[PDB]
Tab-separated table of C-alpha atoms in Angstrom:
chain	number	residue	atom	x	y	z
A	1	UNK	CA	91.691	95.214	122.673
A	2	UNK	CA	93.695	94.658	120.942
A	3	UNK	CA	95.450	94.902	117.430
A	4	UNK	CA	98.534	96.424	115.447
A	5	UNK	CA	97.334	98.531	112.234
A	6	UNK	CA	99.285	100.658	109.768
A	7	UNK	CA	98.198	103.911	108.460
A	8	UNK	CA	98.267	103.956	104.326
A	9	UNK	CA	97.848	107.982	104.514
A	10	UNK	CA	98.633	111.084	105.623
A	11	UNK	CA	96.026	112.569	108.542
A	12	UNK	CA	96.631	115.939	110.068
A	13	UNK	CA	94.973	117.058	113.465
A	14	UNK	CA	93.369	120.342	112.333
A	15	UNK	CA	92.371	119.825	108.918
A	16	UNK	CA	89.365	117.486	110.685
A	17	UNK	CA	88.777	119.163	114.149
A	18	UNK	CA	91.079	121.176	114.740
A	19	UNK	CA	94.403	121.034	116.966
A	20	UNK	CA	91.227	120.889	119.996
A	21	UNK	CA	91.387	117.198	120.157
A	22	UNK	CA	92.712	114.185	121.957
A	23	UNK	CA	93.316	113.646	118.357
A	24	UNK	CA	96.600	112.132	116.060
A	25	UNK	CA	98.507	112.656	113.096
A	26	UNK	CA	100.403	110.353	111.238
A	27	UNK	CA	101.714	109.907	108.565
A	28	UNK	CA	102.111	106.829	105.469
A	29	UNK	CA	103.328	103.905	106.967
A	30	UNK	CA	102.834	104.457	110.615
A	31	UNK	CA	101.919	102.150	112.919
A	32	UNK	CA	99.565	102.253	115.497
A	33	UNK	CA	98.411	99.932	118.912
A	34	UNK	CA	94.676	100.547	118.723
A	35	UNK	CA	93.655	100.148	122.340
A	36	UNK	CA	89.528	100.799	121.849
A	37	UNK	CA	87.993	100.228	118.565
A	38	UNK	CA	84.090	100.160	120.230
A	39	UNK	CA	83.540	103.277	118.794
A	40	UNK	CA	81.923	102.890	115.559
A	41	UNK	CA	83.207	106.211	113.941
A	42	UNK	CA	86.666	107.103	115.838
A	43	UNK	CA	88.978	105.036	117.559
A	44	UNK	CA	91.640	105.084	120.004
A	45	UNK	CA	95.388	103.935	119.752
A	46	UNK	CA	98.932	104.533	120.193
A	47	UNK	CA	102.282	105.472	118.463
A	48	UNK	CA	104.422	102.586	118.369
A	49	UNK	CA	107.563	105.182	117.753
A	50	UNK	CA	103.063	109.468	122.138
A	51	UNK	CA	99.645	108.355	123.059
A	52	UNK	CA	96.100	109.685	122.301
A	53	UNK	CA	93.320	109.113	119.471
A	54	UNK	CA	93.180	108.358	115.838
A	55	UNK	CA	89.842	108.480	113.315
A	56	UNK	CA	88.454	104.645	111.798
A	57	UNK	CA	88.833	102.764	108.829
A	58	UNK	CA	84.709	103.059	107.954
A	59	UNK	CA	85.124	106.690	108.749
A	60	UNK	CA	87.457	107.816	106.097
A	61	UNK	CA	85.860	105.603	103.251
A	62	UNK	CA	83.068	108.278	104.340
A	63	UNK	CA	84.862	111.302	103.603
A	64	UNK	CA	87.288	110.699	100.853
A	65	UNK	CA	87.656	100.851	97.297
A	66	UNK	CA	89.628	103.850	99.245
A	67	UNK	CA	92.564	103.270	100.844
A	68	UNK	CA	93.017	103.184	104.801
A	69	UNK	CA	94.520	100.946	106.849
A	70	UNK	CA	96.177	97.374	106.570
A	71	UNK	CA	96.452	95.134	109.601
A	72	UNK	CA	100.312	94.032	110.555
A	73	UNK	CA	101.854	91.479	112.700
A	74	UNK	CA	105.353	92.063	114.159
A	75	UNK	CA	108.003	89.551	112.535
A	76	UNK	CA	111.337	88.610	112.865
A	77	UNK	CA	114.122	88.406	109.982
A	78	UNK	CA	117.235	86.725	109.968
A	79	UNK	CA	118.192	88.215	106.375
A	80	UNK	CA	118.746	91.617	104.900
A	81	UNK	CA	115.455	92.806	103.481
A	82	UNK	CA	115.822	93.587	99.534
A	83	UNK	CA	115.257	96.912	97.933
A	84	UNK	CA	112.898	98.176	95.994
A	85	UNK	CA	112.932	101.801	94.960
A	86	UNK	CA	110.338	103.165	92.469
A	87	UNK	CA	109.787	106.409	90.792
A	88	UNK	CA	111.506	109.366	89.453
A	89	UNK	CA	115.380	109.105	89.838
A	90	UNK	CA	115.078	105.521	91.476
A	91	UNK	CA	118.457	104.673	89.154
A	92	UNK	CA	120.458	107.098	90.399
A	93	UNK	CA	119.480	106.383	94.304
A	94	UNK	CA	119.733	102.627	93.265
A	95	UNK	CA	123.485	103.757	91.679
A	96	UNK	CA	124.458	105.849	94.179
A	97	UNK	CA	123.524	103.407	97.156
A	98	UNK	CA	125.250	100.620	95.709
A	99	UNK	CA	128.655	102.874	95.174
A	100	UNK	CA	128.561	104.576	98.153
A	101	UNK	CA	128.020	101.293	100.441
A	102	UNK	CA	129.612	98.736	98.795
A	103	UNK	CA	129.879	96.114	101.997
A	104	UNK	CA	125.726	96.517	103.174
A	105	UNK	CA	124.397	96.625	99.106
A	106	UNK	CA	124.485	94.236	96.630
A	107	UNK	CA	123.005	93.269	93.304
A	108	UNK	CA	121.856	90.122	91.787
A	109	UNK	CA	121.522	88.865	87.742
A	110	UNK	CA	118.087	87.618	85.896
A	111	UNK	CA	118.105	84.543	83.888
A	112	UNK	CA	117.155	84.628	80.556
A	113	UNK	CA	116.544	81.972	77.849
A	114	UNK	CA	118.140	83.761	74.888
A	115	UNK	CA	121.707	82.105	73.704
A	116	UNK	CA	124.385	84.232	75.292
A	117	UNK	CA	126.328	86.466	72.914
A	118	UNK	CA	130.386	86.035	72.424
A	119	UNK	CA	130.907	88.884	74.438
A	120	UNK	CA	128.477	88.446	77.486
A	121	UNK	CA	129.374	86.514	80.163
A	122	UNK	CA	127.394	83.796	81.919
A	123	UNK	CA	126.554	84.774	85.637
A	124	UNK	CA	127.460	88.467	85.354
A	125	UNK	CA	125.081	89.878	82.288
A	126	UNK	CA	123.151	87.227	82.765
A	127	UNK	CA	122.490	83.584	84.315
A	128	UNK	CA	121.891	82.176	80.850
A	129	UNK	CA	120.044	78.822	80.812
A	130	UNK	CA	119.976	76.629	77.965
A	131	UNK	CA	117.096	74.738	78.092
A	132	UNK	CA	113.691	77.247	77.516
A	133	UNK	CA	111.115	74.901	78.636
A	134	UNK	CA	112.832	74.780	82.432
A	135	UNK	CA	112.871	78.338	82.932
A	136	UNK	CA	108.622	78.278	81.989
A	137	UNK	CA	107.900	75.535	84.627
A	138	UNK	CA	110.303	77.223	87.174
A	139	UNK	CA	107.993	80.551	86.312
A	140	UNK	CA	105.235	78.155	86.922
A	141	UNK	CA	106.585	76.863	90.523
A	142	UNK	CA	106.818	80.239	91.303
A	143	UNK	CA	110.682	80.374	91.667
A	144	UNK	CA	110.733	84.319	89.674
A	145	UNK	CA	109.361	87.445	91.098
A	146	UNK	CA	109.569	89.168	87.726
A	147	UNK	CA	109.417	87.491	84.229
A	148	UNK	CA	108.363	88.097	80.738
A	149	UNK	CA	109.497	88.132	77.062
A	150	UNK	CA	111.221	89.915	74.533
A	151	UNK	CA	112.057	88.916	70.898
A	152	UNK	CA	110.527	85.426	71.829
A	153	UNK	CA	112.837	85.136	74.691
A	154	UNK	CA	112.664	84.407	78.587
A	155	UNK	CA	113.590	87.305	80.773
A	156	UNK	CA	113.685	86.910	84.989
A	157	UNK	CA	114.166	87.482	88.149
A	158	UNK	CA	114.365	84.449	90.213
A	159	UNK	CA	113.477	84.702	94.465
A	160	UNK	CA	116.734	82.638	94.615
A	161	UNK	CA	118.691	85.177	93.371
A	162	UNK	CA	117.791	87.484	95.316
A	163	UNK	CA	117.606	85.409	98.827
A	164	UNK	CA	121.498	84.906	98.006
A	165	UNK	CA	122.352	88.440	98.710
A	166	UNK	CA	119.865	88.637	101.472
A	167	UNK	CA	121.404	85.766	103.437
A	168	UNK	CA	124.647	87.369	102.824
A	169	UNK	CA	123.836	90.199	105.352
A	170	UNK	CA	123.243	92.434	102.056
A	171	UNK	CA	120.353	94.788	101.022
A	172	UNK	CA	119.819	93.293	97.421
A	173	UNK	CA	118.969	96.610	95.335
A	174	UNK	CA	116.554	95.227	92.838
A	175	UNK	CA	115.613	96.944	89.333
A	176	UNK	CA	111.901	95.469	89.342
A	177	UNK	CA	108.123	96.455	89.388
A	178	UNK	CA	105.878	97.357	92.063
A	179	UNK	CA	104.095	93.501	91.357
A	180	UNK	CA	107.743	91.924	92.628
A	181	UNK	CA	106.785	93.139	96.101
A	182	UNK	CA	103.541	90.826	96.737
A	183	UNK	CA	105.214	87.912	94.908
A	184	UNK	CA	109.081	88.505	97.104
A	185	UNK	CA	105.934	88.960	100.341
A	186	UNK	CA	104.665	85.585	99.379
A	187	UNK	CA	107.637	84.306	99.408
A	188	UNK	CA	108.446	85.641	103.007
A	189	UNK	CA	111.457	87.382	101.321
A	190	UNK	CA	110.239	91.339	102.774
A	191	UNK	CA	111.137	94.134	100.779
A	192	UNK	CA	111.521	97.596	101.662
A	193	UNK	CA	109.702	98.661	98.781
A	194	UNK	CA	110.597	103.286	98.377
A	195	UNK	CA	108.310	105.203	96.246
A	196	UNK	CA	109.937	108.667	95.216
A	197	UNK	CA	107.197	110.925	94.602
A	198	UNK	CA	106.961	114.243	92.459
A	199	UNK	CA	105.067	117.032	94.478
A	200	UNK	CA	104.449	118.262	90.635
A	201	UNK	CA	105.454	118.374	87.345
A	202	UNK	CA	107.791	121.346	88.500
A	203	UNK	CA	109.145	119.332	91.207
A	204	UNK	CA	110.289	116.338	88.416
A	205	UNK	CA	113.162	118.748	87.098
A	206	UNK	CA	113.878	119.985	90.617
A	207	UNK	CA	114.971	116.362	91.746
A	208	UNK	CA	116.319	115.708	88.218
A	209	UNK	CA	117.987	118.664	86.919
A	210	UNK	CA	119.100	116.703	83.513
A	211	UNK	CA	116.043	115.275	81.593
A	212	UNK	CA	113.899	117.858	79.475
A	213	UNK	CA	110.451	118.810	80.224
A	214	UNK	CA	109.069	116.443	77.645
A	215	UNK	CA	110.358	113.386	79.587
A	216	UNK	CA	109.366	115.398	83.299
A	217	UNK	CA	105.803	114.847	81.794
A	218	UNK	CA	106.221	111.226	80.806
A	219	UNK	CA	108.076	110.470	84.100
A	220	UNK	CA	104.979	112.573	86.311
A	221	UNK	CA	102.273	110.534	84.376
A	222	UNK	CA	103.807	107.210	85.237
A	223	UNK	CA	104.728	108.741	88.949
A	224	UNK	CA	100.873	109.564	89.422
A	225	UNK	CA	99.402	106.144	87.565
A	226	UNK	CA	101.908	103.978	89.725
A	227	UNK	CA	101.116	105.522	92.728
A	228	UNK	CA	97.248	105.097	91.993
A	229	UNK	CA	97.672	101.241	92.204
A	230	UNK	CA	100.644	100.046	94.177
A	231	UNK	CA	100.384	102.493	97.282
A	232	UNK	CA	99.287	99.729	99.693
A	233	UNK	CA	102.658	98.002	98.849
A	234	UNK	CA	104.432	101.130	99.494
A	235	UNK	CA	107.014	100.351	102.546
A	236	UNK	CA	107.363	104.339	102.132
A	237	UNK	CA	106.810	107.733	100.542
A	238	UNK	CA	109.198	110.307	99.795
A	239	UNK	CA	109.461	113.568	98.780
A	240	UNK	CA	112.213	116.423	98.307
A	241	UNK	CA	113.085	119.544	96.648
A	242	UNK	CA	116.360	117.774	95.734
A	243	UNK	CA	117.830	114.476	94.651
A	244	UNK	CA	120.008	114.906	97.694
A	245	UNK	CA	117.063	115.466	100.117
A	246	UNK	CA	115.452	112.533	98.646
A	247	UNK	CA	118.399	110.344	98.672
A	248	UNK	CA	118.867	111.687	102.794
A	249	UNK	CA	115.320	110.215	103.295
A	250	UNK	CA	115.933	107.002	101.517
A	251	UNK	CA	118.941	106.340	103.261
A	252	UNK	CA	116.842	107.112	106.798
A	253	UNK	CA	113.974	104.980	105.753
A	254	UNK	CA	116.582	101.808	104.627
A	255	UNK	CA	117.947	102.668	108.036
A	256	UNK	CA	114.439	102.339	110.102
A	257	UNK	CA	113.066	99.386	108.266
A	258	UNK	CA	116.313	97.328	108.578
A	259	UNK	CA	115.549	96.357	112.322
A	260	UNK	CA	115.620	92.747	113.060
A	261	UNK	CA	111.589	93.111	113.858
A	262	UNK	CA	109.627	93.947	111.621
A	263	UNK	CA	105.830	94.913	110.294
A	264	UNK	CA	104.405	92.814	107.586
A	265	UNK	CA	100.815	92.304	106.959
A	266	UNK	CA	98.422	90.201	108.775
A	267	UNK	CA	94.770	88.166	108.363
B	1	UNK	CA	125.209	99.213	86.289
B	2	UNK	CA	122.581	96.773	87.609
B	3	UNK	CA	120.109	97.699	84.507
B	4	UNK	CA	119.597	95.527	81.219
B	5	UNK	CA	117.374	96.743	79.005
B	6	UNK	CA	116.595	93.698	76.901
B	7	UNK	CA	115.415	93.163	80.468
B	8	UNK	CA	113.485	95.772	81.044
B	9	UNK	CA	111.918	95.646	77.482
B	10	UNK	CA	110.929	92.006	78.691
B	11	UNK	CA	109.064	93.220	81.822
B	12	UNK	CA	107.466	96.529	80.506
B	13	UNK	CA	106.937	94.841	77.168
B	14	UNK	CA	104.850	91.881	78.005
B	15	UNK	CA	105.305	89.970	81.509
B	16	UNK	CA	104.200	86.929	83.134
């Protein structure tokens, strides 16, 4: 006795032994006060949002490099956490949020090394540096969450961009990958990182009632891949029947994970 | 309004 542990899966009372437990459920990205871990098998704990009994970590690698728990410390924040929403329809919740509450989202520009064109404008389209050779070592100092190349040009995201709009009370709504979250994580810049997820291929043109079945496919494949490797970064999981029902969970979830204290993971 | 995708072609091309 005694540490703090969040669950990184859905676990349902009767589906192991029955409803005719002490037992818990939970679901992704709960987390628990384990009060007695001395059992080797099963171990006891506490909803920290409600008390009883929860199965192990060595246990369910038995059952099912599987995923379980991660242990978290509590933290405080003195900035707006960024956003990162992944999956099908993340643009329009990313739109939509950003539209809808103007004064609590914001968004921030990446830098790139290629020579602005006429009609671009520096600090809007992009922060357009001149000298090539600076952006690489800043990549190298670890000033970008997010940076690669196209048509032999520099392409970023820097952490200082985005700690702008975070120390300006704003949720910074961020078009990146899943690998910004570790990298905004190490640089103690917390993310509440969203991943929409399809309940089936069915359930793609449900939430997006525009795109044809031959891009539902494409945008299911990538849905099920990304979710194979990322989960663990996952702040949470959604689902819906609906964009709207999605975009009511989103806006809950932003909502919950905004609190001054928060859970981040530990040693 | 937030997306470039010379941007995006840079990240899901070929990333650091």
């Amino acid at each position: 006795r005694g540490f703090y542990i969040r669950a990184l899966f859905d676990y349902d009372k009767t589906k192991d032994c029955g409803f005719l437990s002490q037992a818990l459920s939970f679901r992704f990205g709960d987390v628990l006060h384990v009060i007695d871990a001395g059992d080797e098998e099963w171990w006891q704990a506490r909803r920290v949002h409600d008390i009883g009994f929860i199965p192990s970590k060595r246990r369910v690698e038995r059952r099912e490099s599987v995923l379980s728990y991660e242990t978290v410390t509590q933290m405080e924040v003195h900035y707006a956490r960024p956003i990162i929403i992944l999956g099908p329809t993340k643009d329009r919740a990313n739109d939509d949020l950003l539209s809808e509450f103007p004064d609590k989202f914001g968004s921030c520009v990446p830098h790139t090394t290629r020579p602005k064109r006429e009609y671009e404008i520096d600090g809007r389209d992009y922060h357009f540096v001149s000298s090539r050779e600076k952006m690489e070592k800043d990549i190298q100092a670890h000033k970008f969450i997010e940076a690669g190349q196209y048509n032999s040009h520099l392409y970023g995201t820097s952490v200082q961009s985005v700690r702008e709009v975070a120390e300006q009370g704003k949720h910074c709504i961020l078009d990146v990958s899943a690998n910004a979250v570790r990298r905004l994580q190490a640089a103690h810049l917390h993310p509440i990182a969203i991943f929409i997820r399809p309940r089936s291929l069915e359930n793609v043109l449900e939430i997006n009632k525009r795109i044809t079945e031959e891009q539902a496919r494409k945008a299911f494949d990538r849905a099920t891949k990304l979710e194979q490797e990322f989960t663990e970064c996952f702040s949470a999981i959604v689902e819906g029947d609906s964009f709207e029902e999605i975009y009511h969970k989103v806006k809950r979830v932003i909502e919950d994970l905004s609190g001054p204290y928060i859970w981040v993971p530990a040693r | 309004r937030i997306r470039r995708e010379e941007y995006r072609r840079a990240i899901n091309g070929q990333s650091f």
